[PDB]
Design a protein around this ligand. Structure first.
Ligand SMILES: O=C(O)CNC(=O)C(=O)O
Ligand SMILES: [Mg+2]
Ligand code: NI
Ligand SMILES: [Zn+2]
Length: 331
């Protein structure tokens, strides 16, 4: 069995290997990369996502989100307070202001210590989940807006024909902006490209041990657990590496830098934070190996998780017994 310790693997494809996306995902799996829940892919030196970023300040963040925390430093939840619209130029200036800028630090490890110590005492503002793409249309390799769609995958593997679309999303981050512990909708894969700016630190639990994390989360957030049998679908709970280690939960960590891709694998729980002003692009995708995970994915029916249009068909086809209850939570 490849990668039995479930380490995060890092890949350096050649320009030739970068042509066929699906093939390279299958390659990484042949080497055991999925067992970690997360892999890093460093593009060949000849590749570029786009010519320059010199023109991105005009993008609009229609609903910036202020991430307010409650709890203790290692075990907290965050809620998103909506703020007035602002341009990327406005947001970058805010990120770099004395109130929000990254503090002096020695190295990534020092900065990680400062994040876990102090996160809860601040409320950073995140421009998340913005439909759009920063890949040049002429970039043919690993262009996240030109992937094969999840609908097409389900049609090819299962023969059924469904509505729905699959487009990328932009994320504008600043110091301490935080992504809570989650798997993807329908336990899909994700791919994330860091276009520019400061790094993103990731934490991940191997898919084979996801239920260990869920059991700890039920213990640590007991009112939330009573409210919903899949409350991590709400994407609000944070648990630190120190707390994970105290409770024996297997995990790994890695820091993504600008120019790098990360792939999350089906049912790979992940969480993390941004080091300073940055911009990422991400999208969900499927492969044939995902279908079994889609069929078994948990679902929130309490009403909190509210998701895209396109998840309807996935539930309806893969989880018909759950469909009626889940759709009530949508409506
Ligand atoms: O970058 C972020 O804030 C969060 N991204 C993801 O959870 C992902 O790409 O799957
Ligand atoms: Mg612009
Ligand atoms: Ni994710
Ligand atoms: Zn719920």
């Amino acid at each position: 069995a490849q990668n039995p310790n479930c380490n995060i693997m890092i890949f350096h494809p050649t320009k030739e290997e970068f042509n066929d996306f699906d093939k390279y995902i299958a390659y990484m799996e042949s080497q055991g990369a999925h067992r970690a829940g997360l892999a890093k892919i460093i593009p060949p030196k000849e590749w570029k996502a786009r010519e320059t970023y010199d023109n991105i300040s005009e993008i609009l963040i229609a609903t910036p989100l202020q991430q307010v925390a409650s709890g203790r430093a290692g075990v907290f939840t965050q809620y998103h307070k909506k703020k007035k619209a602002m341009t990327v130029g406005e947001y970058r200036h805010l990120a770099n202001s004395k109130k929000y800028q990254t503090p002096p630090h020695q190295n990534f490890e020092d900065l990680e210590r400062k994040y876990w110590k102090n996160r809860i005492y601040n409320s950073p503002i995140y421009g998340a989940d913005i439909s759009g793409s920063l890949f040049d249309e002429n970039t043919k390799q690993w262009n996240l807006g030109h992937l094969g769609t999840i609908q097409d995958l389900l049609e090819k593997e299962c023969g059924v024909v469904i509505e729905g679309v699959n487009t990328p999303y932009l994320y504008f981050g600043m110091w301490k902006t935080t992504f809570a512990w989650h798997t993807e909708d329908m336990d899909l894969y994700s791919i994330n490209y860091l276009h520019l700016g400061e790094p993103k630190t990731w934490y991940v639990v191997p898919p084979e041990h996801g239920q260990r994390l869920e059991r700890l989360a039920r213990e640590l957030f007991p009112g939330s657990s009573r409210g919903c049998g899949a409350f991590l679908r709400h994407k609000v709970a944070l648990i630190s590496p120190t707390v994970l280690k105290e409770n024996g939960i297997p995990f790994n960590r890695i820091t993504q830098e600008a120019g790098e891709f990360m792939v999350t694998f089906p049912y790979g729980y992940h969480a993390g934070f941004n080091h300073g002003f940055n911009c990422a692009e991400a999208i969900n995708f499927a492969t044939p190996r995902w279908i079994d995970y889609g069929k078994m994915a948990s679902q929130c029916s309490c009403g909190e998780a509210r998701v895209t249009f396109s998840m309807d068909a996935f539930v309806r086809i893969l989880q018909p017994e759950r469909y009626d209850l889940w759709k009530r939570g949508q409506d």
